[PDB]
């Protein structure tokens, strides 16, 4: 189907405790494949998926150089942002960046991204045109002016439409065993008495990849959204994900409730009921 490649970056200042820590990770879809941490003993970008291990020494050297240089520019950026926000040097602050591409089944660019956040808030984002910017505030407009002057968007567009897309195609081929395999959810319903008057029904989805899934409960065919406890999809640690959805069911109503499961690894959505 469609696919994505994303790089995530976080720098966190720590005044009086050395220089900001820089951590970046790369994903294809929901698969982590590279990481770099400036607090490592010998910081290098390191593989995290089997299909990237075959890249040769020039790849790792180049990627490591890019990471180290971004750690440095982020430290300069944290200093600039203290100025732009009139902040003191005393506190810890955070700078986040994400960029990458989404492609369709034919490998063509669907959308590119490049966006930043400061202290957990949107700061500046490249728009979907890959040519203009959305600045969150008057500080980010100062950045936008500089990036317009320097034609930064054009350099990002060139990467996002070219290299980004081409790397993702390469990775999807080299990783075709796993990146191009959906693992469907393993599903079941459990029953948990609460009192004489009610019990929880919990609908489980386990072992699935990728992470996107829809789990819902209906009663007499009506969605129970407001009355469903839906936990965040969570990693199992074996590449796969888990999720559950629970409803509080009055005594004797169990067969009126149905759980519905949608996932790309399922040829047809599933319907499940409690089976005593």
């Amino acid at each position: 189907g469609s696919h994505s490649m994303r790089y995530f970056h976080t720098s966190v200042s720590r005044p009086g405790r050395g220089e900001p820590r820089f951590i970046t990770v790369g994903y294809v879809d929901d698969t982590l494949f590279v990481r770099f941490d400036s607090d490592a003993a010998s910081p290098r970008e390191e593989p995290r998926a089997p299909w990237i291990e075959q890249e040769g020494p020039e790849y790792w050297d180049r990627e490591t150089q890019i990471c180290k240089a971004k750690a440095q520019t982020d430290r300069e950026d944290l200093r600039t942002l203290l100025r732009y926000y009139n902040q003191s040097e005393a506190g810890s602050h955070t700078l986040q960046n994400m960029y990458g591409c989404d492609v369709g089944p034919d490998g063509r660019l669907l959308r590119g991204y490049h966006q930043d956040a400061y202290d957990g808030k949107d700061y500046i984002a490249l728009n979907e045109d890959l040519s203009s910017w959305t600045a969150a505030d008057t500080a980010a407009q100062i950045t936008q002016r500089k990036w317009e002057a320097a034609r930064v968007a054009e350099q990002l567009r060139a990467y996002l439409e070219g290299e980004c897309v081409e790397w993702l195609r390469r990775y999807l081929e080299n990783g075709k065993e796993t990146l191009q395999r959906a693992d469907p959810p393993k599903t079941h319903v459990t029953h948990h008495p609460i009192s004489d008057h009610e019990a929880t029904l919990r609908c489980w989805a386990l072992g699935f990849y990728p992470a996107e899934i829809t789990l819902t409960w209906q009663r007499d065919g009506e969605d129970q959204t407001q009355d469903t406890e839906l936990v965040e999809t969570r990693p199992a640690g074996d590449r796969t994900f888990q999720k559950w959805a629970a409803v509080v069911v009055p005594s004797g109503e169990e067969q009126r409730y149905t759980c519905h499961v949608q996932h790309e690894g399922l040829p047809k959505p599933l319907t499940l009921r409690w089976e005593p």
């Binding site: 790089y7 790369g26 790849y59 180049r62 990627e63 890019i66 990471c67 240089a69 971004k70 520019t73 300069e76 950026d77 600039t80 942002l81 732009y84 960029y99 490049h114 930043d116 700061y123 500046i124 950045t143 500089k146 990036w147 930064v152 350099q155 990002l156 990467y159 290299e163 980004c164 790397w167």
Partner: peptide, 9 residues
């Protein structure tokens, strides 16, 4: 593979 263009805010 990563973007190589240095960018400062």
């Amino acid at each position: 593979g990563r973007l190589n263009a240095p960018i400062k805010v």
